[PDB]
């Protein structure tokens, strides 16, 4: 009945930490759904699921408000998800990194980086090869 729908909405606003948390999530993600916390990201992101939603809406992430150096309260993008949670979020696998951690290597980045385009840390292409032809160096002494 309609009364039960209103009660569900009241439970939704109650289950986000009160009115302030409800408003924060509404203005940060334009969604106020409540789901089971799959896990927490080292950079601050939180990953939730709800299998009762249809495919595509059954997994989501609340992004952190503080990334490496920038304020991400309003400026968020899909490039801030770490690779393991990237695999879990895009439904490439059913096992979260919490229960199926990736293999550990000493060359894998320990600190994820987002898209740094339009930023002094952007990639600038250059040639990785050395000089090909060496020119003759004239002697430093006079010839006469």
């Amino acid at each position: 009945e309609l009364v039960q729908v209103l009660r569900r909405g009241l439970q939704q606003v109650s289950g986000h930490g009160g009115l302030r948390g409800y408003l924060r999530v509404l203005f940060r993600a334009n969604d106020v759904r409540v789901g089971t916390l799959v896990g927490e990201d080292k950079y601050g992101n939180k990953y939730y699921e709800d299998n009762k939603q249809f495919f595509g809406r059954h997994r989501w992430v609340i992004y952190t408000t503080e990334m490496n150096g920038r304020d991400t309260f309003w400026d968020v993008d899909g490039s801030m998800v770490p690779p393991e949670w990237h695999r879990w979020l895009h439904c490439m696998t059913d096992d979260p990194p919490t229960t199926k951690p990736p293999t550990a290597r000493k060359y894998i980045w320990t600190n994820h980086k987002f898209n740094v385009s339009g930023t002094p840390q952007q990639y600038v292409p250059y040639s990785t090869t050395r000089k090909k032809i060496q020119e003759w160096v004239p002697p430093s002494t006079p010839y006469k």
């Binding site: 690779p83 990639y123 990785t128």
Partner: protein, 176 residues
């Protein structure tokens, strides 16, 4: 074996004529269309909450390129130039020389991402699984030059995305 789509004749009895006259005067099929639109109005929309929600993908998905390493940290690429030869768009440029220890390694490995058609042929032709197409697809830039990857950029991509690339390969290498 065929069927007709518009070879039906209408009944000419008085009842059918009255029904068609009511259809014409009272616009029954227009109300049918209105009812269908109203029915669609009350359904759940298929929209997903991007970027907080993502569309499904597969381990076969072809995205940003990356150069992989062995578990010891040594690069897998041996400068065989098979990926450069098989590239339909000629987006790969490779230059190689013997290393200080005599290994066969590259000195230049460029992929023009504005030339690449993302066909995945390079990772099929690679005999050591060195060059792969990662799962990343959100790497839009603000300048053209940022999409001209050199060896350093691809090595950084591999080091950054290995945790997911290895898992994607493990789930699909038996289909290859």
């Amino acid at each position: 074996t065929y069927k007709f789509v518009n070879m039906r004749e209408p009944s000419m009895d008085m009842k059918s004529v009255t029904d068609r006259a009511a259809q014409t005067l009272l616009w029954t099929e227009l109300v049918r269309g209105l009812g269908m639109t109203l029915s669609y109005l009350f359904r759940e929309p298929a929209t997903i909450n991007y970027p907080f929600e993502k569309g499904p993908l597969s381990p076969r998905f072809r995205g940003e390129h990356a150069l992989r390493r062995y578990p010891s940290g040594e690069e897998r690429c041996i400068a065989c130039k098979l990926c450069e030869a098989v590239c339909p768009a000629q987006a790969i440029t490779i230059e190689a020389e013997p290393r200080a220890d005599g290994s066969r390694r590259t000195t230049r490995y460029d992929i023009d991402m504005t030339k690449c058609i993302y066909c995945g042929f390079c990772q099929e032709a690679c005999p050591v699984d060195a060059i792969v197409e990662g799962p990343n697809f959100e790497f839009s830039t603000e300048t053209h030059e940022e999409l001209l990857y050199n060896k350093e950029k691809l090595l950084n991509n591999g080091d950054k995305w290995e945790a997911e690339i290895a898992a994607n390969i493990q789930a699909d290498y038996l289909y290859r």
